[model samples]
Target: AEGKPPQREKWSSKIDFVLSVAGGFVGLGNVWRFPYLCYKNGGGAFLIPYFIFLFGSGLPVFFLEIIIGQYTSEGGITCWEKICPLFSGIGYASVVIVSLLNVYYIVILAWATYYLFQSFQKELPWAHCNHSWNTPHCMEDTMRKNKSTNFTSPVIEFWERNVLSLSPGIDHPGSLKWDLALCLLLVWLVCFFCIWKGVGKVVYFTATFPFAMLLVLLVRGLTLPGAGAGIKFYLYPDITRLEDPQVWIDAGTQIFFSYAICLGAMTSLGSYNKYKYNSYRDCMLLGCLNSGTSFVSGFAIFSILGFMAQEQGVDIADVAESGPGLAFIAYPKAVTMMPLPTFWSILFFIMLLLLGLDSQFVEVEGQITSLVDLYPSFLRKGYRREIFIAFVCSISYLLGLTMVTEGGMYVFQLFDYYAASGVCLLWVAFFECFVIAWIYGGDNLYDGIEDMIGYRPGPWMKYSWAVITPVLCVGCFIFSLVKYVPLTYNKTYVYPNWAIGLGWSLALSSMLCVPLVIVIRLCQTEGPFLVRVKYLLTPREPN
Candidate 1:
C-alpha cells in the first residue's frame, strides 16, 4: 500500500471548489436562523455588527482556513502540525465536533426527504387536522384569516405528532418510528452516492437549482399581500439593539458557524485547490457572496413569514420560530395558502433537500479528507471512496436512529446546543485563531498568502487575524460562558440536570481534546517545564 509518490487530487476549476464550498454554509440555518437572528439582534441594525464580524472574524478566519489547507495541501488535523505541531489537536477536536454533528445532521435531511415525499399529495396532511396524529390542541388553522389563540396550528401538530411523535421528555425514547428510519436510510444512500464520486460531483445537483427555486419562492413571497410588512419587520434597523453586548456576541457566533470558520470543512475544501491559483481573490469573492446569501435568503424568507403572520392576524415574531421550525412549520403554513400550493411546496422542499444535502455531503467530504489526507494509502485501495462512504454513512444512520425515535427531537436539541452551537464552537474557533495568529505568527501567514497570489494580504487581513478578530472572539467566548443560558425548549421545558451534564460532556469531548493533545506533546519532550512550553509553542517544518 505504499503510495507511488502520494498523488493529491485537484478540483477541475475554482468554480467547482467555490460552489461546492457553499454546500453546508448556506444551509437551512441560513434559511431561518440568520434571518431570525438578524430580526432579533437589531433588524436592519444587526448588519453593522454582522458584517463587522464577518470581516473581522468570519471572512478572516474563512480565508485563513482555506489558506492553511491549500498551503499544506493537507487537512485540518495535519495542516496544523506543520504550522505548529503543538496545536494539531485543534484539528482533532474539529473533526470530533463534525463527527458528532453528522449523526444528527443526517436526521435533518431525512426529515426533509420525508416531507419532500409527503408534499406530492393533492392536499398536504398538515393542511388540516383530520389526520390521525392531530393533537387535541390542534385548532385546524387554515391559511385563511383566523383569530385562533392558544391553539397549535395544524402544521405544528403534524410535526409533533405525525412526524416526530415527540415524547414528553428524554426519559422515554419510545419506539423507533420505522417510517422515519427508512427515510434515514434513503438519506444515507443519497449522501453516499453523491460523496463517493468526489467534490465536483457534489455540486453537480446542488448549487444551481436551489437558487433558482429560491428565486421562485422569493417572487411568490414578494407578491403576497403582507410580504412587504415582513421584509420591513426584518429590516427594522433598530439602532438600540446594536448597543447590547449580546448582539455582537450573536453576530460573531452566527458568522462563525455560517462561514464554517472552525469546522475544518473550509480547510478540507481548500485542500483540493490548484497550487498556482489566486486563492486570495477567490477568498474575498466567495466570502462576500456567501455572507450576502444569508441576507438575500432572509428577504425571501421573512417576506413569506409576513404573509403567514398577516394570514393569521398574528405578529411575525409569533409566527417566526427560529431554526427548523421556521422552515418546516412557519413557511409551510403560508405555502398552503398559495395557488398551486402543492407545486410550490414540492419545489420548495426539493430545494431544501438539495441545499441541505450539499452541505451535509461536504461535511462528509471533509471528514473523509481528514482520514485520506492524513494517510494517502487509504485512497489507493480498491473502491476506497465508495466503500469508505458506505461505511461512514452506515454508522451515521445507526447513530441517527436515536433522533428518529419519539424523543429524537429533544436529542437533536441536545446535540445542536452542545455539539455544534454555543460555547463549544466559540472555544474551538478561539484556539484556531490563537494557534495561527499568535503562535504561528500572522505575518508569516500573510507572506504565505503573498507567495500563493502575487501580493500580500491587506491591513484587514493582518489586523483581524492578529488583533481585532482574536480579541472579539475572546470577548464573545468569555461573554458566552458568563451568560451561558442553560438548554431548554421554548423557555418552558428545562432540560433535566442529567441531560445538561451529558450535553456538557459531549462539548468537553471536543474541547478537552485540544489541551489533551498539548499535554501529550508536552510530555514527549524531556526537559524542564519552561523548555517544554517553549518547544510546544514552536512551529515544525512543512510536510
Candidate 2:
C-alpha cells in the first residue's frame, strides 16, 4: 500500500480547466508578437492566410492535443508512449523545447520587472537623455528627419544601455547586470511559489486581469490623438503582398506559436480534465479567443504607435517595430509622450508582467508535470513537489543569467530565433499529426474520443490530421529553410559564423530528439528491424 501512488488529481471544474488553458496560451505573444507581425505583413491582408492556417491546421491540431491529453491522462513525454511508442521522442522533444522555453521566457519577465520598478521614479527613466548611461548618440525630442545626425532616442538608449547594458555583439559576454539578475531571481521565486500550489484557484484572477488591462488600455489608446490613423495603418490592406510565399509562412508560424500548439502546453493542460470534458467545444472557443485576442490587440498596439508617430512627425511605419523594440523601445517612447507618463508606463509594464507571468507558470508547470508523471512515486511524495520546483526554478534562473549580461540581448535574440522557433515546433507538429493519422490510425483516435465524450468528430478532422496538417507543417519547414538567412542582430549586425553554427545547434537540439529516439528505441528492441519497427508503430492500448 505504501508503494502505491495517489490518484492523479483533476481540476475542480470545467471552468477551471478552460481558464487555465486560456491563461496559458493567451500571453506575451498576443501582446507583443502578434500585433507587430500583423502590421509587418501588409496589415489586414495578413488575416486571410492566418485564418486559413487557423482552421486548416491550428484548430485541428489544437483539438488533437486536448483530446490526446484528456483521453490518455498522461503528461507530454509519457503521453506519446500511449499513442505510438516509436514516436515517444516527440514527447521528449516537447520536454526539451519547453525546458529551453522555461530558460528564456522568464528572462522577458525579468526585463519587465526591471521596467516596472523603474516606472515608480518621479521622471520616467527613459523619458530623457540625462542619465549616465546616455551617450552622445542619445537624443531628446529629436526628429528622425536628420538621418545624417545619427541620433537615438532616450527610450532606445535606456533599453540598450541602461536596461540591457548591451555590448557590441554576441562575441562579448559582458558582465551580468546585477539589477537584472535580482529581478530575474525575483521572477523565478514568484513563478515557483505560484505553481508550488497550482493554477485553478488562481487562474480566475490571472486570466481575467489581462483582459481587463487590455480593455482599459484599448479605450485609452483610441481616445488619444492620431488613434484613427493608427487603426487605419494597422488594417489598411496590402493585398498584393499575399502573393508572397513568405506571408503565408509567417501566418502559419504565428498561428502555431500563439495557439501554443506543438509545445506540449495544450496537452498538459488538457490532461487535468475529467475524461468526458467537452474538448471539442472547448477547442473551438479557445482557438477563436486566441486569434480574436491577437486581432483586437493590434488595434490597441498600433493606435499607440500611431499616436507616437503623430507626436514625432513620422509615418506610422517609422515607429512600428516587432519584438523587444516594440515592447521596450517604441511603445515606451509613446508612453513617455503621453500625459502622466509614469502612470501609463506602470500600467503597461504591469500588464506585461501579468501576461507573461501566467504563461511562464504554465511552461514551468508543464515541464515539472512531465517529470512527476515519469517518476510519480519519487516526485509526488510529501514535500518533493515544492523541493523539485525550487530546484527547477534555480536551474532556470542560472540559465537565465546569461541573458541579463551586457551582450544578453543578442543571446536573447538568438534564443528567440532558434529555440522554440516555429521551425522546431513545426517538425514536432508534423510528426504528431503523421503518426496519429497514419500510424496510430485516425479512426482509433476518433473512437477513443467517442469513448470518452460520446461522439466522433467529423471526418474533416481526420483528413486534416492525416493530410492537410502535416502538408502545411512540412511545407512551411521547407520554405523556412529555403528562405533562411544567417542570423542578424536587429537586421544590422550579422552574427559570426560560429554563433550561427551555435544557433543551428540550438535548433537541432530538440528536432534531433525525434529520429534519434526512433533509432535508439528500435535498436533496444530484440527482433528483426521490421518487426521491431512494427511493434513500436503499434498503439499501446487496444481500441
Candidate 3:
C-alpha cells in the first residue's frame, strides 16, 4: 500500500467557495440567454415567475445542493449516493448532464474565441458586408431602406458563413471548419490550464474578471445614446404575455439554466468549502448576485441593441435577438457602429472570453472532482491531477469537434434543445428534491443548515424543499413535454425525424439513468426482489 493518508482538496478560504459558486452559477447563459428570455417573454413582466421560481424552487434546491456537498464533504454523484445509495444514478445523471452541457457549451466559447481575435482589427470583420463568405442576402443598414432588401446582416452572414461555415442540415456534416476547430481548441486549452491546478488557483483569477468585465461593459453600454429605449424595451412589461403559460415555463427554464441548479456545478463548487461554512448565507448571497447580474447584463446588452435600433431606424423589438445570435452577431454589429468601435469591440470580446472561460473552468473542475471523488484510488500517490484534467478536456474537445463541422450548428441546436434545456434538468431536480426532502427528510437538511449558519430555516424554505419545489418542477416538466415543439432553429429550420429522434436520445441518455440505475442497484443488492425494491426506494441514512 502507498503509505499515505487520503487527502481531499479544499478551497483556501470561504471567499474561494463563494467566488467559485458565483462563477458556476453565472456564465454565458446569463449574458446571452437571460436578456432574450426577459425581452421575449414580456420584458419586465418575465421577472414575476423568474423570481417566484427563484425563491420557490431555484434558491431552495440551489442552497440544498451546496449544503449536501459541504455537509457530506462529497461531490454531486458521490454526494447523492451518500444521501441515499438507491438513487446513485442521480449522481451519475448529474455527471451526464454536465458532460452533455460540456460538449456543446464549448461551441459557444469557440464562437467567442473567433470573435475575440476578429475584434482587434480596425474594422470588425462582422461589421461590414464585404467578406467572401457574405451572402447575397446580407443587408448592411438596419434602416428598412429597401422594402425587401433581404432579411440578414453582415454580422449574421459572417457568423453563419465564416465563423460557423454551417451546413444546411445534419444530414450533411461536411468537413470540419478548421478555423472553429482551432478556436475550440483554444477555448478548451484555456479551460484546461485554468482547472489544471484545481479550483483554488482557477477561482482566484476567473472569479473576479467576469464581474469586473460585466461592470465595465454595463457602464459603457448604459452611457450610449438611445440606451434608455433599450432599457425601456427591456423593462417595459407587456402584462398580457404574463398570462401565457409559455411565459411561466420560459421563466422557470431560464432560472435553471442561469443558476445551473441541477447541473452538479453548484455541488461541485460547494464540495471544496469547509463543513461549518455558512453555505445558507452564501447561497442567498450568490443566488441574488447571479440573478442580479443577469438583470444588469440585460442593460449592457440591450442598451447596445437599443442604439442599433436607433441607427437602423427600427423598433427595439426588431433587434433584441437572443442566444448565439445576440452574443456573436447582434451585439458585435452594434458595437461596430458605435464610435471607437475597435476599442469597444476588443473590450467586449475580452469580457466575453472571461465570461465563458470562468464558467468553463468550473464545469471542467466539477466533473474532474466528481470523477476523483467517485474513485479515490487516483489520490493514492503520484497522481498528477493535471493528467486527469487534460484527459477530460481532450475527450470533450473531440466530442465537441463534431459541432465545429459545416453542419455543427444544426447539431448544436439539436443538442441544446434536447440536452441542455429544461426536461432533463427538471427530472434531475425532481428526484433530487424528493430523495432529499421526502426520503432523507427536509427537517434533517434544515437542521444541517441551521447548524452551519446559526440561522433557523424558515418554514418557507423547508416546505419549498419538501413540497412546493418538487411539485412545480414536475408540473413544468410535464407541461414542457405536453407542449413540446420539435427542435427548430430561428423557428424555421425544422429538424428531420431522425434528427429529432437523435435529440430525444441525447436527453433520455442522461435522464434514463435515474430509473436505469435503480434497476441495476436492485439487481446487485443482497435482498429478495421485493425487499430490495423497498430498500432502494427508501433513504438508508440516519438523521
Candidate 4:
C-alpha cells in the first residue's frame, strides 16, 4: 500500500457531476452559434444531419473518452500511455492544445464580465448607435431623458452600428485601450479566483447560474413586442440549405465542438469518478443533455433577436448574426428594446459569464490534473506545486489579454477560424477508436470496462467503437478538409494565404508530433549507448 498509486474519487453525487459537465458543454456557442447555424443551414432540416452526426461523430467519441478514463482510472495523458506507451504523445499534445484554447477562452469571459457590468446601467451600451440618423429616437437619448421608458429602437441602432457598420479599424467602444485593459484585469482576476479554489467551486456555480440566466432571458424575451417573429424565424424549417456541402460540414463541426469530443476534458473528468460508475449511462446522458440544451437555448436567443428586428424595422436576417459579435451587438440591442433594459442586460451577461467560466475552469483543471497525476512528487512538495501551477496558468491567462486590445477581435476571429476544435477532434477520435479497437483490442477494452463497472459494453457499442464510428469520423474529417473554405461577407472564399498557412500549421503540428516522437523513440532503441542515454534522460515516473 505504501508504494501504491493514489486512488481517484468518484463524484460525491452523480447529479453534481452531470450538471457540472452539462454546464461545461453548454456555452456561448449554444446561445448564439447553434441557433444561427440552424437557421442558415435549413432550420429544422439541419437537425437531420445534426442528429446523425451527433450519434455518429459526437456521442461515440464522447463514450470512448469516458470509457478510456473509467477503464484506466487516470487522466488523459497517463490514460493513453498506460494503455499503450507509443501513444503517450497524443495525450501530451492534447494538453497543449487545450491549454492554448484556455488562453483565449478566458478573455472572452472577461468581455462577458464587462457586458454584465454594463447591464446594470439605466442606459444599455448596446441600445444606441451614435450613427443612427434619428438621434431623438435613439435608446441612449431616451435613457437619458426618461430612464424608466423602455426604448427598443436604440438597441437595434446600436447593433447595426457595431456589427453592420464597415470600418477599417476593429470595432470597440470609445476609450478602447484603457477599457480593454481594465476588462482584461477583471477577467484575469475572476479566472484566478475561481480556479484557485479548484473544481468544487466551479461545479457549484455552473449548476446554479445557467438556470438563472435562462429564466431571465426567457421572461424578458417572451414579453418583447415582436419576440414571436424571432422565435418563428429561428424555428422555421428551411429544407433547401441542406443542399450545400458547407451546411453538412458546419453541422458536423458544431456537433463535434459542442460535445467537446477528443479534447480530453471528458476523459480527465471521467477519471475522477468511482470505479463502479456507469460510464455508458454517463455518456448517453451527457450527449442528450448537450443536444437538449442547444435546442432549448435557441428559443431564448431568437425571441430577443425577433423583438429587436421588429423594433428596428429590420428583417430578422439583418439582426440574426453568430459568434461573439451576436452577443456583443445583437443581444445587447435586444436588451435595450426591453422595458427594463438594465435589469435584462445584467442578467444576460451574468449568465454568459457563468456559462463560459464553468466550461473554461474544467478545461484548465483537466490540464492541471494531468500534470499532477503524471508527477505527484512535484505537486506534493509544500506550496511549490501550487505556486508553479498558478504561475504557469497566470501567464497563459495574461496572454489572453490580447483579445481586449484594439486588434483583439481580429485575433479572436483568426483563432476561431484556424485554432478551432473541429480540425483535429475527429481525427483524434478516429485514432482513439483505431488504437483501442484494432491495436489495444476491443475485447480487452470491454474486459477492462467490465472490471470497473460490473457489466460489459454491448455488441452495438463494440461495433460502434470498432467500425461504424471510425468510418463516420474518417468521412467527416475528409469532407471537412475538402469543403473547407474561408468566407467573406459576400459568401465567397476569400481567405488570405497567411491565414490558410497558419491553419495548416496549427492542425498538422499535433498530427505530425505523434509520428515524430515514435520515430525518435525507435531510433534511440536501435543504439545501445543511446538506449542507456534514453534511460538516463527519461523520467522514472510517467508524464
lDDT of 2 by residue, 104-174 (tens): 88887888888889889898888778789899877565545444355666776777777777688888897
lDDT of 3 at 501: 82
Tell me the tens digit of each residue's lDDT in model 4 across 229-253: 8777765667776656666766777
Tell me how many clashing residue pairs each candidate has.
3, 0, 1, 3
TM-score pick, better of 1 and 2? 2
The candidate that wins on lDDT is 2
The local distance difference test score of each candidate is 0.76, 0.79, 0.75, 0.66
Which portions of model 2 miss their true places by more than 4 Å? 1-5, 39-46, 137-148, 198-204, 239-246, 320-323, 337-339, 383-385, 541-543
Structure candidate 3, residue pairs in collision? 167-406
lDDT of 1 by residue, 1-543 (tens): 466465567887777776777665778667756765665554677777777877677877888788888888877778877777777788888888888878887777788888888888778888888677776666644543544436777887787778777788899988889989999888788778767664435446556777787777777778888888988887767877654666776677777778776778888888888777898776787777776777787787778777777777767767644544556776687677778889888888888787777778778778887876676765647777567667877887888888888888888878876787766777887777777777778888778778887777678877776788668877877666676666566546778899999998988888888878888988888999997887767677443
Task: Please give the RMSD of candidate 1 to the true structure.
Answer: 2.8
Error of 1 at 183 (Å): 0.3
Return the lDDT, model 3, position 103: 87
How does each model score on TM-score? 0.91, 0.92, 0.90, 0.83
Worst 10 residues of 4 by lDDT: 166-175
Q: Candidate 4 lDDT (Cα, whole model)?
A: 0.66
Q: Which candidate would rank higher by lDDT, 1 or 4? A: 1
